[PDB]
Design an enzyme around this catalytic site. Structure first.
Site, short mmCIF file in Angstrom:
data_model
loop_
_atom_site.label_atom_id
_atom_site.label_comp_id
_atom_site.label_asym_id
_atom_site.label_seq_id
_atom_site.Cartn_x
_atom_site.Cartn_y
_atom_site.Cartn_z
N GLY A 172 -24.93 20.96 -40.19
CA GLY A 172 -24.69 21.28 -38.79
C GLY A 172 -23.32 20.85 -38.28
N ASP A 183 -32.55 22.44 -21.89
CA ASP A 183 -31.95 23.44 -22.77
C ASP A 183 -32.89 23.79 -23.93
OD1 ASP A 183 -30.15 25.27 -23.87
OD2 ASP A 183 -28.96 23.72 -24.88
O1 BA1 Z 1 -29.86 18.89 -34.27
C1 BA1 Z 1 -29.79 19.34 -35.40
N1 BA1 Z 1 -29.12 20.48 -35.63
C2 BA1 Z 1 -28.45 21.22 -34.58
C3 BA1 Z 1 -29.32 22.43 -34.23
N2 BA1 Z 1 -28.79 23.11 -33.07
C4 BA1 Z 1 -27.81 24.17 -33.21
C5 BA1 Z 1 -26.47 23.63 -33.66
C6 BA1 Z 1 -26.56 22.97 -35.04
C7 BA1 Z 1 -27.00 21.50 -35.00
O2 BA1 Z 1 -26.18 20.82 -34.07
C8 BA1 Z 1 -25.09 19.98 -34.56
O3 BA1 Z 1 -24.80 19.91 -35.75
C9 BA1 Z 1 -24.35 19.23 -33.50
C10 BA1 Z 1 -23.29 18.37 -33.81
C11 BA1 Z 1 -22.62 17.70 -32.79
O4 BA1 Z 1 -21.59 16.86 -33.07
C12 BA1 Z 1 -23.05 17.91 -31.38
C13 BA1 Z 1 -22.35 17.21 -30.25
O5 BA1 Z 1 -21.34 16.56 -30.46
C14 BA1 Z 1 -22.90 17.34 -28.87
C15 BA1 Z 1 -23.95 16.39 -28.42
O6 BA1 Z 1 -24.37 15.39 -29.24
C16 BA1 Z 1 -24.47 16.52 -27.15
C17 BA1 Z 1 -24.05 17.54 -26.29
C18 BA1 Z 1 -23.07 18.47 -26.67
C19 BA1 Z 1 -22.48 18.42 -27.93
C20 BA1 Z 1 -21.43 19.44 -28.31
O7 BA1 Z 1 -20.90 19.41 -29.44
O8 BA1 Z 1 -21.11 20.32 -27.49
C21 BA1 Z 1 -24.18 18.83 -31.12
O9 BA1 Z 1 -24.66 19.10 -29.88
C22 BA1 Z 1 -24.78 19.46 -32.20
C23 BA1 Z 1 -30.47 18.59 -36.52
C24 BA1 Z 1 -31.16 17.41 -36.24
C25 BA1 Z 1 -31.80 16.71 -37.25
C26 BA1 Z 1 -31.75 17.17 -38.56
O10 BA1 Z 1 -32.37 16.49 -39.56
C27 BA1 Z 1 -31.07 18.34 -38.86
C28 BA1 Z 1 -30.43 19.05 -37.85
#
Ligand code: BA1
Ligand code: MG
EC number: 2.7.11.15
Lengths: 61, 338, 618
Positions: C167, C286
């Site tokens: 991710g 969300d």
């Molecule tokens: O949450 C997951 N995956 C999500 C699913 N949503 C769709 C997007 C892909 C991924 O999200 C991320 O990789 C991700 C990485 C980040 O650094 C951030 C942020 O920095 C961020 C945040 O922590 C809170 C608000 C906004 C943000 C942003 O980046 O805009 C995020 O929102 C998602 C996930 C959680 C546990 C696991 O074992 C495997 C995956």
């Protein structure tokens, strides 16, 4: 209290009711004691080094 | 009625002053003026007893003039062999706040106590060998300041509750109580015959008590501050005291007044302990300036100084046989001198 | 690499740490996994009086976990036949308590509640002397060894072995990783500190940490939970539940639209997940399929908790969310809201799993303001293929009026549960993740003009966190059994070694020692004993030959030595003594118990003329 005051008066009558000897006689009798026992006091009349534990004495009970 | 007795309260005090001035025909220093001086007494330190881990507050020789107990801020009592430096017993206490200690004349027991308000009696030879507590003496509502044995089954204690008390060690009760002092009692000394004992306090007065009858015979004021220690003259008709004013004083019982004052202008700190030599000619005083001084008791001259502690000499005591003096200090060492 | 427990002597410090916080109570220890496990060991193995009581407690717990009514009637009578005839001949139960239990039993009705009266009466008997006997025993000593480890948790990237990316995002990227400590599988989420300053994600990132913390208690199977949070000089970091099955938005691309039979499954598990968040006064704000993840078996959880929000102390009014899934009260300027919004998002999301888009998204439009205008105005036109009980549900969820919407009338999640659509399911079984899933997954240099100030670092000063029951469950299901045995061997070997050496009993016993334990002087490690008037210490071999009195202490302060916190004693003679500690509980307690020690000591001396400092100099 009145008990506290009367306690003192009874005591102070008790302290006045002791007879006293003259300081001349008081001192003279002490000086009599020191003079007399001066021979046996080792801080004044030291004993032989070997007979004193803290100098050269070797054998102990 | 309250007023009525406070006039006689001082009418008798003045009867006493005038009663005593009648005896003041000559002074001790006058009578003694004839005898030879004792001359400089240069005692050297012959042993250093090292073991305690913090301040020493109280020591006490045994009757054998060999063994001695010493209480300490480090929470241990120690019994030393003065002849060799060997420790006979290291007894760790059940309360850290110890202040006094005492050796039985029998030598079978020792005692101590402090802010615990209890005089604890230790048995120096159990039916095995382990040193154990054989009695606690609860009673005082104040710190234990000093205590001494009469025999195995009797002990006398003084306390900051402004009183003293004679104990029966078996039952652990108070045979007799000694009310009279209006401030904290600090030290006591048994008469050699034991029928009497003197006490000293923070009211700047010392009192001769009639042990068996249980009351105050005489009261000797004169000091301008807290009497910290006290000691009987070998024949038991006079005693010495030490105080924060920086003076020792010799009081005679039959004369019922002060005889002598020991105090150089240079000596400005307090006195923490007092002890006579075997004859009684020498009066050894321990000082807050780290030194024990040696007074000619009869002439009031300073014979010499025991100087070799890095902190307050908090206690001292001559042996029965007069062979040696022991000084105990806040530097954590005892030292045997002669 | 592996957890080493501290020595038993830690008890002296820890017990006093816990006593001060009231955490040495039956109800406090018993309700903890590690506390419970150690307690039951003691009762079963080391106290015959407690054995049947615990055995009976544990038997009642297995009965609670039975699935259906017919299995229960079996176990119900089965239980009352055996242990109960032993306990009624003992420790008798109350007439009042048996009355209720036997009343239900006589009628052949068997709920989980059935035995609840016997639970309470067991505790009454377990929390009295049986508990105090436990405190005195070596299993409490062992509890304290473990509790020390919990409150000394300092995490870094050394502790984790990171593997593969799973991710990307704005501030960082999510990974998959193993915790070297236990060998537990986790998902790391590393947000770059240089990126967060470039986007002003200050309150946003600090919010997530709070939100994750608020939801992670309670042991829920439907939200991606946090176990730890920590930071390095240049990065933030979360340790979350691992999910190797991808998000529901990706699978919607590969599977196309789902059937009603399949949408139900997801809806159920998503609902129970929301229920968890709402009972804890948290609004998610969300809900979209991209935020829903799948494990390797197929089951789902909610994930991204950045936009979530606490609504207990005050209700929010922001426009937070994704533009297809926001409720009307969120989009309006100053309209406050609560759990209301997450139900509207459920309708919007559940629609997309059936049809392939948000009901307000049309002609695949990408115009946020037009999409928001559909929510507030447009009544949602439902298809004809759709079943009646589905139409019943969705228009309940997508109702604009909050007072007229399902899950907002008073009973919250329960109103949606009891809807006509979910009429087939046994909701207990849903929670137990027992229904079969429908899908089973197959097998930079932009922030170089921005420096990291030490003013900015203070905003994350109280960032790091460790969820207690989470860490305790981790240890429980991995290394707890085997480590107890190993530290048991050591503690028996050291005793056996000391017996050959002619063991000298504790220096602390029989006296008035306050507390005692290890520390390092100046480094030189030494064992200390604090007494009311002094602070001794010894080396490994002899008794204490060195000390420091209480009256010598001017003040006890705290200072840094090569970035590690220590105590700074100031001695009366202008000297300073510096102490280090092996753990944070020790640092807090030593500081305190000395500050209380010298302050008590210095007042006691004041009174005593024989111990105080009298005038000397003219
Ligand atoms: O949450 C997951 N995956 C999500 C699913 N949503 C769709 C997007 C892909 C991924 O999200 C991320 O990789 C991700 C990485 C980040 O650094 C951030 C942020 O920095 C961020 C945040 O922590 C809170 C608000 C906004 C943000 C942003 O980046 O805009 C995020 O929102 C998602 C996930 C959680 C546990 C696991 O074992 C495997 C995956
Ligand atoms: Mg709003």
């Amino acid at each position: 209290s009145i008990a506290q005051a009367r306690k003192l008066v009874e005591q102070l009558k008790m302290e006045a009711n002791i007879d006293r000897i003259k300081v001349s006689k008081a001192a003279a009798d002490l000086m009599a004691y020191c003079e007399a026992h001066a021979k046996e006091d080792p801080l004044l009349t030291p004993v032989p080094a070997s007979e004193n534990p803290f100098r050269e004495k070797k054998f102990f009970c | 009625e309250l007023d009525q007795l406070r006039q006689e309260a001082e009418q008798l005090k003045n009867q006493i002053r005038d009663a005593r001035k009648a005896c003041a025909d000559a002074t001790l220093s006058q009578i003694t003026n004839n005898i030879d001086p004792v001359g400089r007494i240069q005692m050297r330190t012959r042993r250093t007893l090292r073991g305690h881990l913090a301040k020493i507050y109280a020591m006490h020789w045994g009757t054998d003039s060999r063994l001695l107990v010493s209480a300490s801020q480090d929470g241990k009592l120690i019994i030393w062999d003065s002849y060799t430096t060997n420790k006979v017993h290291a007894i760790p206490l059940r309360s850290s706040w110890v202040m006094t200690c005492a050796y039985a004349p029998s030598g079978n027991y020792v005692a101590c106590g402090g802010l615990d308000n209890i005089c604890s009696i230790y048995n120096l030879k159990t039916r095995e060998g382990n040193v154990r507590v054989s009695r606690e003496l609860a009673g005082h509502t104040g710190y234990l300041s000093c205590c001494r044995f009469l025999d195995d089954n009797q002990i006398v204690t003084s306390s900051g509750d402004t009183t003293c008390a004679l104990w029966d060690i078996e039952t652990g009760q108070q045979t007799t109580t000694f009310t009279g002092h209006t401030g904290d009692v600090m030290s006591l000394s048994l008469a050699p015959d034991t029928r009497l004992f003197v006490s000293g306090a923070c009211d700047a007065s010392a009192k001769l008590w009639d042990v068996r009858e249980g009351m105050c015979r005489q009261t000797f004021t004169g000091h301008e501050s807290d009497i910290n220690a006290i000691c009987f003259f070998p024949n038991g008709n006079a005693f010495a005291t030490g105080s924060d004013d920086a003076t020792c004083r010799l009081f005679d019982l039959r004369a019922d007044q002060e005889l002598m004052t020991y105090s150089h202008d240079n000596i400005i700190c307090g006195i923490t302990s007092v002890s006579f030599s075997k004859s009684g000619r020498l009066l050894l005083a321990g000082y807050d300036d780290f030194n024990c001084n040696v007074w000619d008791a009869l002439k009031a001259d300073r014979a010499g100084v025991l100087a070799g502690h890095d902190n307050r000499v908090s206690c001292l005591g001559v042996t029965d046989d007069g062979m040696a003096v022991a000084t105990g200090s806040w530097d954590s060492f005892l030292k045997i001198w002669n | 690499k592996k957890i080493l427990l501290p020595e038993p002597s830690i008890r002296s410090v820890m017990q006093k740490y816990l006593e001060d916080r009231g955490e040495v109570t039956f109800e406090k220890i018993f309700s903890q996994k590690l506390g419970y496990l150690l307690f039951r060991d003691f009762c079963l193995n080391h106290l015959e009086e407690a054995r049947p009581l615990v055995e009976f407690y544990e038997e009642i717990k297995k009965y609670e976990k039975l699935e259906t009514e017919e299995e229960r009637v079996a176990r119900s009578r089965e239980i009352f036949d055996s242990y109960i005839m032993k306990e009624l001949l003992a420790h008798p139960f109350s007439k009042s308590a048996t009355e209720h239990v036997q009343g239900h039993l006589g009628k052949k009705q068997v709920p989980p509640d059935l035995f609840q009266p016997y639970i309470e009466e067991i505790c009454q008997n377990l929390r009295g002397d049986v508990f105090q006997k436990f405190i005195e025993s070596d299993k409490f000593t062992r509890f304290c060894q473990w509790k020390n480890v919990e409150l000394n948790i300092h995490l870094t990237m050394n502790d984790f072995s990171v593997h593969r990316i799973i991710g990307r995002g704005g501030f960082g990227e999510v990974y998959g990783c193993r915790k070297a400590d236990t060998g537990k599988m986790y998902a790391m989420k590393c947000l770059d500190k240089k990126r967060i300053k470039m986007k002003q994600g200050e309150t946003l990132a600090l919010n997530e940490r709070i939100m994750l913390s608020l939801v992670s208690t309670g042991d829920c199977p439907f939200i991606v939970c946090m176990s730890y949070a920590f930071h390095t000089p240049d990065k933030l970091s979360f340790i979350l539940d691992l999910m190797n099955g991808g998000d529901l938005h990706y699978h919607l691309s590969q599977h196309g639209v789902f059937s009603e039979a399949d949408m139900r499954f997801y809806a159920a598990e998503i609902i129970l997940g929301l229920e968890h968040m709402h009972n804890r006064f948290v609004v998610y704000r969300d809900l979209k399929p991209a935020n829903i993840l799948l494990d390797e078996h197929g089951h789902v959880r909610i994930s991204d908790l950045g936009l979530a929000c606490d609504f207990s102390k005050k209700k929010p009014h922001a426009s937070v969310g994704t533009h297809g899934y926001m409720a009307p009260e969120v989009l309006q300027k100053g309209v406050a809201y609560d759990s209301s919004a997450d139900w509207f998002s459920l309708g919007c999301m559940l629609f997309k799993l059936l049809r392939g888009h948000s009901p307000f998204r049309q002609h695949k439009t990408k115009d946020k303001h037009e999409i928001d205008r559909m929510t507030l105005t447009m009544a949602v036109e439902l298809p004809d293929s759709f079943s009646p009980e589905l139409r019943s549900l969705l228009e309940g969820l997508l109702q604009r009026d909050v007072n007229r919407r399902l899950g907002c009338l008073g009973r919250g999640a329960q109103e949606v549960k009891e809807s006509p659509f979910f009429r087939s399911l046994d909701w207990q079984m849903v929670f137990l993740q027992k229904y079969p899933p429908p899908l089973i997954p197959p097998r930079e240099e932009d922030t170089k003009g921005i420096k990291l100030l030490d003013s900015d670092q203070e905003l994350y000063r109280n960032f790091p966190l460790t969820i207690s029951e989470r860490w305790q469950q981790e240890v429980a299901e991995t290394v707890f059994d085997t480590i107890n045995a190993e530290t048991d061997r050591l503690e028996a070997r050291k005793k056996a070694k000391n017996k050959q050496l002619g063991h000298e009993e504790d220096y602390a016993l029989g006296k008035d020692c306050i507390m005692h334990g290890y520390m390092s002087k100046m480094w030189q490690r030494r064992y200390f004993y604090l007494f009311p008037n002094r602070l001794e210490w010894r080396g490994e071999g002899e008794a204490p030959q060195s000390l420091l009195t209480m009256e010598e202490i001017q003040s006890v302060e705290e200072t840094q030595i090569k970035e590690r916190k220590c105590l700074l004693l100031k001695i009366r003679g202008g000297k300073q003594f510096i102490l280090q500690c092996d753990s944070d509980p020790e640092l807090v307690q030593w500081k305190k118990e000395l500050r209380d020690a010298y302050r008590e000591a210095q007042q006691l001396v004041q009174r005593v003329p024989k111990m105080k400092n009298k005038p000397r100099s003219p």
